[PDB]
Write a protein that binds this ligand. Structure first.
Ligand SMILES: [Mg+2]
Ligand SMILES: [Zn+2]
Ligand SMILES: [Zn+2]
Ligand SMILES: [Zn+2]
Lengths: 147, 86, 266, 69, 56, 45, 56, 115
């Protein structure tokens, strides 16, 4: 406990001393680029989506959102969104006629994890559909926390 | 080669410096780690730095330090003849 | 039998007070440490939530459930899940409880520990039942619900020791004192004018004679005649707490001896 | 939010005494210290556990449920 | 000043510090995750072939 | 289709991709996704 | 890092947790305490720099 | 997160032995015993009982780091006496003393009435 350090009771920590809940919110919108381009909430597939993240899309539903109460970990996608691409653009190869969409999903923070608490879907002032997803986590005192 | 001072009139310190020792040890450790021939018997060693330290202790490092002077001249000092007292 | 002596001063269902005489300080300290951190006990370890519309979080309720004390009288008949041959859990190494609460009334409804229902095969054992230690017959106030809110979950309880997590701790505060008159000079009493008048006398001072007030300091004396008081959370009887602490310490020493013999063979 | 199940310092069960403490304060018109002593809480570690607790679950229960059933 | 004299560098780590009275003067405790992230390139030699193979 | 809940009148709705985000009963424009029906495991530590 | 003693070479010790650990006697040269202070760690990538770091 | 699993405190790992005994070259007839997954509870008790043996010249124990649950015990006995035998004697004394204490506690408890 030297130099402004402290010693905490592990038993007290186990019993619930200085334990906290951490809520983190993510927001995403469906942007409409002109009369031609528009983004949509989707569960992108490996055969029709390009540049999709290496994470796991198993937790998404048909609407591209994780239902509340599901556990998520690092690199897990919580909001799945796709946008169309213009032809005549090949990147690192791997671009065939099958691909017609590209991923623009919002992934969970790499170091964070928890359980999805509440996801709400609504429309903004412009009428575009946007969603807000909240994730809970438990912070227990550690050997680096400040009190 | 007017910039090479003959050995008979060298005026620099005859003692190896800390920086010279550090660079000699590092260079010899790098060479050993790159599978260089070791001229000292090993009683069981795996660290190239430790092997280089043994070589320096027994004066078996075939390297010469070219000490430069502010005017561009230089003096060549063998590691074997340089005293390691620090 | 002519070894450590025990004299019980007060015995109850929650506290046992005794004098442990003719014993070593190391032995007494090890006894209390083992009684605090190494007595096996049954507690809820995993929770699966089927419905939770409460104002509280699933992890919150899981922690509160895991801190509920459960009966562990026959814990020795239960097996460790790590040492059991089963996929996840079975009746030989775990106990399954279920909680179902609904807000059927307009007023707030309290979900206590008495609402937990055992759905496993106890096989005639005496473990699993939550401890009820209040006049009204309820238990720990696990949660509160309003009209229209439901809590549905299943808890799986496994045996463990407080070293892994404090929730398995079967012993509460343990009074531990010796030499109330400071005859061994193991403490230098801080004082301003008079240490004797500034430091209150411990209740145990009545069981030992006061200093002779002028006799030379006894340098051959050793610590002994410890006064101990064990408090139990209710998972197991307090006398059982003491007995199983001694048993655990004996088993640990015997394990050391067995390991030494095993190495001797090789 | 709700009364802790166990005392942090020692681990005594205190989550089964919140209602009794409130009843002693209200119906019996007993002081907080006397009620704590009557409940069997001798160590000040448990005394503070029950004395300084704030019941926020009551306020949280005033909001309408998010989901019905 | 912003990109030549000083610049962002790799093979570095940052985190809170603590005092350990059981550590030598020159010893520094490094978290296991930071150790697993930071790497050192060791050249394969007859003296470390087996150890490097075991690590691989 | 997926099941949602109005954020004001707490009515369960069944919405498709084409249907507009709106409560057909009261008209509220905020919907909360229904909790998943698959069990989630929690440790009691 | 106002002076050369604020950046010194240490020997790694892989320990359990999420904080660096350092001896108490080396806090004064670093002008550091454990109220939340952070310190940087850099890993050399060559034998020459390794030996220089350990010898100077 | 880098917090070790709590069962590492007492559960022995793979390829790990409870005791690791090595001779000590610092002095004659001295040995160092490393106890794995053990702490002060056993260290202090065993050391205190060893100090009571008349044929034991040195008995000490230490825990190098509280992070790891293991401790070292240095034992040096008189010439002709095995430190292994000294440890065996101390352990047997502990077992017998604990058994006597358990019997005394049981007989005393059976005499009470309130519980
Ligand atoms: Mg500071
Ligand atoms: Zn089993
Ligand atoms: Zn308490
Ligand atoms: Zn509505």
């Amino acid at each position: 406990n030297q130099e402004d350090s402290m010693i905490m009771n592990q038993s007290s920590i186990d019993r619930g001393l200085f334990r906290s809940l951490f809520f983190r919110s993510y927001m995403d919108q469906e942007k409409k680029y002109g009369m031609s381009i528009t983004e949509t909430f989707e569960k992108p597939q490996r055969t029709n989506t390009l540049r999709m993240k290496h994470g796991t899309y198993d937790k998404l539903d048909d609407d591209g959102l994780i239902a509340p109460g599901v556990r998520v970990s690092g690199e897990d996608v919580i909001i799945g969104k796709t946008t169309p691409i213009s032809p005549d653009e090949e990147e690192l190869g791997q671009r065939t006629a099958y691909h017609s969409k590209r991923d623009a999903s919002t992934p969970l923070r790499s170091t964070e994890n928890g359980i999805v608490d509440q996801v709400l879907v609504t429309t903004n002032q412009d009428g575009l559909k946007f969603v807000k997803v909240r994730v809970r986590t438990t912070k227990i005192p550690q050997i680096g926390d400040k009190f | 080669k007017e910039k090479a001072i003959p050995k008979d009139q060298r005026a620099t310190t005859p003692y190896m410096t800390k920086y010279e020792r550090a660079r000699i040890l590092g260079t010899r450790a790098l060479q050993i780690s790159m599978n260089a021939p070791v001229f000292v018997d090993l009683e069981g060693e795996t660290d190239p730095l430790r092997i280089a330290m043994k070589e320096l202790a027994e004066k078996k490092i075939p390297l010469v330090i070219r000490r430069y002077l502010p005017d561009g001249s230089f003096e060549d000092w063998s590691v074997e003849e340089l005293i390691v007292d620090l | 039998s002519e070894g450590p002596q025990v004299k019980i001063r007060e015995a109850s269902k929650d506290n046992v007070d005794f004098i442990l005489s003719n014993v070593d300080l190391a032995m007494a300290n090890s006894l209390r440490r083992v009684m605090i951190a190494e007595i096996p006990t049954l507690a809820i370890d995993s929770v699966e939530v089927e419905t939770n519309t409460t104002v509280l979080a699933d992890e919150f309720i899981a922690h509160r459930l895991g801190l509920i004390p459960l009966q562990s009288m026959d814990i020795e008949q239960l097996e460790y899940s790590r040492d059991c041959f089963c996929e996840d859990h079975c009746d030989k190494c775990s106990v399954v409880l279920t909680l179902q609460a609904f807000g059927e009334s307009e007023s707030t409804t309290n979900v206590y520990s008495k609402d937990l229902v055992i759905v496993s095969n106890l096989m005639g054992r005496n473990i699993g039942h939550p401890i009820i230690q209040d006049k009204e017959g309820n238990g720990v106030l696990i949660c509160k619900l309003r009209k229209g809110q439901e809590l549905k979950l299943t808890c799986v309880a496994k045996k463990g020791i407080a070293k892994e997590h404090a929730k398995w701790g079967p012993a509460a505060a343990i009074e531990f004192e010796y030499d109330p008159w400071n005859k061994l000079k193991h403490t230098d009493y801080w004082y301003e004018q008079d240490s004797a008048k500034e430091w209150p006398q411990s209740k145990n001072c009545e069981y030992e004679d006061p200093p002779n007030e002028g006799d030379p300091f006894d340098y051959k004396a050793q610590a002994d005649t410890f006064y101990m008081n064990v408090e139990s959370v209710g998972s197991i009887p307090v006398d059982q707490v003491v007995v199983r602490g001694i048993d655990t310490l004996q088993k640990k020493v015997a394990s050391i001896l067995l390991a030494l013999t095993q190495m001797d063979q090789d | 939010m709700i009364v802790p199940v166990r005392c942090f310092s020692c681990g005594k069960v205190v989550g089964d005494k919140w209602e009794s403490y409130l009843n002693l304060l209200q119906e019996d018109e007993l002081d907080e210290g006397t009620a704590l002593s009557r409940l069997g809480l001798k160590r000040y570690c448990c005394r503070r556990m029950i004395l300084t607790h704030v019941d926020l679950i009551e306020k949280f229960l005033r909001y309408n449920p998010l989901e019905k059933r | 000043r912003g990109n030549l004299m000083g610049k962002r560098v790799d093979f570095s780590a940052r985190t809170v510090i603590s005092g350990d009275p059981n550590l030598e003067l020159d010893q520094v405790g490094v978290p296991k995750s930071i150790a697993k992230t930071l790497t050192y390139p060791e050249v394969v030699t007859p003296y470390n072939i087996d150890r490097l193979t075991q690590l691989v | 289709t997926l099941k949602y809940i109005c954020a004001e009148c707490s009515s369960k709705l069944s919405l498709s991709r084409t249907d507009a985000v709106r409560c057909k009963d009261c008209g509220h424009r905020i919907l909360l996704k229904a909790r998943t029906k698959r069990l989630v495991q929690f440790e009691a530590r | 890092s106002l002076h050369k003693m604020s950046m010194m070479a240490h020997r790694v010790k892989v320990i359990p947790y999420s904080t660096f650990r350092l001896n108490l006697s080396v806090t004064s040269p670093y002008n550091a305490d454990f109220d939340g202070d952070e310190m940087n760690l850099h890993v050399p990538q060559s034998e020459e720099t390794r030996a220089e770091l350990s010898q100077l | 997160m880098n917090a070790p699993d709590r069962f590492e405190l007492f559960l022995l790992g793979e390829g790990e032995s409870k005791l690791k005994i090595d001779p000590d070259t610092k002095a004659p007839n001295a040995v160092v015993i490393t106890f794995e997954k053990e702490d002060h509870t056993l260290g202090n008790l065993i050391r205190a009982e060893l100090l009571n043996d008349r044929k034991v010249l040195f008995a000490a124990y230490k825990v190098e780091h509280p992070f790891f649950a293991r401790f070292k015990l240095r034992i040096q006995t008189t010439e002709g006496y095995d430190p292994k035998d000294a440890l065996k004697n101390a352990c047997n004394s502990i077992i017998n003393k604990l058994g006597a204490l358990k019997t005394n506690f049981e007989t005393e408890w059976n005499l009470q009435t309130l519980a």
